[PDB]
Structures are given as C-alpha cells and as structure tokens.
C-alpha cells in the first residue's frame with residue numbers, strides 16, 4: 001500500500017475546487033479542511049468541496065469535517081479512494097446526467113444521505129464502506145426520472161433510515177456482495193421488484 005506523498009499534510013481551502021472535464025485531481029493522500037463553506041449541518045445552503053465537471057475525475061483525498069456539501073458531480077466521473085471523515089449535508093451529489101462511479105474509500109457520520117441523485121444517471125458504488133448514516137443513496141424526493149444504482153462490494157454499518165430510497169417507479173437498484181449491519185429496512189422504493197441482485 002503506497003500512502004500518497006501528501007499524506008500528513010492539510011490543505012485548508014476557502015472556495016470550491018473545480019476539476020475540469022478531462023482532468024484528474026489527485027490528492028495523493030492530502031486531507032482537506034474547508035473553511036467559510038458550511039458547517040456540515042443539514043442546512044441546504046453549503047458549498048461543495050469539489051465541483052467535478054463532466055468528464056472530470058477525483059482521487060486520493062481525505063475530506064475532513066466540515067463536510068459542507070461534499071462533491072458535486074456533473075456526469076461521467078470517477079471518484080476513487082475518497083474518504084469522508086465526517087459527511088456534511090451529503091457526501092456526493094449527481095447534478096447532471098452521466099455515469100458516476102465511486103470506487104474505494106469510505107464515509108462516516110452522515111446525518112441524512114450519503115449520495116444524492118438529482119439527475120438521471122448510472123451510479124455505481126464499488127469497494128466502499130459506510131458507517132453511521134441515514135441513507136446510502138437518495139434519489140431526489142418526488143422525482144420520477146430514471147436512475148440505475150449498482151452497489152458492489154459495499155459494507156454498511158448502522159443505517160438509520162434505509163440503504164436506498166427513491167420515489168421513481170422506473171428506477172432500479174442492483175447489488176452484488178452487499179453486507180448490511182443494523183438496518184431495519186433495506187430499500188424504500190415504490191415496489192420491491194425494482195431491486196435486484198446480480
């Protein structure tokens with residue numbers, strides 16, 4: 001395991017980091033602490049830590065408290081080995097259509113949702129651990145566009161609400177090697193037949 005060369009450094013930011021289409025932001029293990037961008041509460045007016053334009057990628061960062069409004073993804077993004085030490089309002093939001101992959105990493109202490117899906121998308125979560133969360137995935141409430149979610153090699157502890165929730169009959173969730181400790185209801189979708197194993 002190669003700890004990254006920025007391991008032990010702390011980058012304190014005062015504005016959202018924009019990653020442009022075709023770019024990969026590689027933190028090399030840096031921890032980021034945002035200031036003046038939110039308190040990580042449930043208030044909806046916080047700034048994202050990162051804005052990933054379409055086709056932008058992010059890897060190898062630790063996001064410290066306050067988690068603010070996390071990572072805004074505009075589609076066709078790979079988010080790799082990102083650690084949310086303390087999720088803010090939410091950890092990552094899909095803001096526009098495309099494929100978004102969260103691969104590796106982990107999240108902790110999400111008062112409400114970890115992942116917010118606010119546009120039609122294909123959303124994959126792979127090799128990921130989350131503990132003390134409300135929900136892992138929430139399609140924006142009362143929307144009926146289609147998302148397809150894949151949960152692959154995902155381990156969840158202490159889920160207060162549910163693993164995933166959608167109000168869309170056309171959305172689907174697919175899982176493979178999903179382990180869930182301490183959750184009363186796995187999936188809150190219009191019908192349970194929207195949920196599949198593979």
Ligand SMILES: O=C(O)[C@H]1O[C@H](O[C@@H]2[C@H](O)[C@@H](O)[C@@H](O[C@@H]3[C@H](O)[C@H](O)[C@@H](O)O[C@@H]3C(=O)O)O[C@@H]2C(=O)O)[C@H](O)[C@@H](O)[C@H]1O
Pocket residue numbers: 044089090093112116118138139140141142165
């Ligand atoms: O992108 C965002 O941050 C969106 O946050 C809000 O919406 C989410 C969710 O999509 C809503 O259904 C609603 O969720 C319910 C409740 O208010 C709370 O989140 C928790 O008890 O879960 C409920 C549920 O999942 O149905 O509000 C959510 C929230 O984050 O508070 C906004 O309403 C959206 O416009 C986005 O800004």
Ligand SMILES: [Ca+2]
Pocket residue numbers: 042089112113
């Ligand atoms: Ca919330």
Ligand SMILES: [Ca+2]
Pocket residue numbers: 044089090
């Ligand atoms: Ca919200």
Ligand SMILES: [Ca+2]
Pocket residue numbers: none
């Ligand atoms: Ca709300």
Ligand SMILES: [Ca+2]
Pocket residue numbers: 044069089090093116
């Ligand atoms: Ca949010």
Ligand SMILES: [Ca+2]
Pocket residue numbers: 040086087088108109110111
């Ligand atoms: Ca939190």
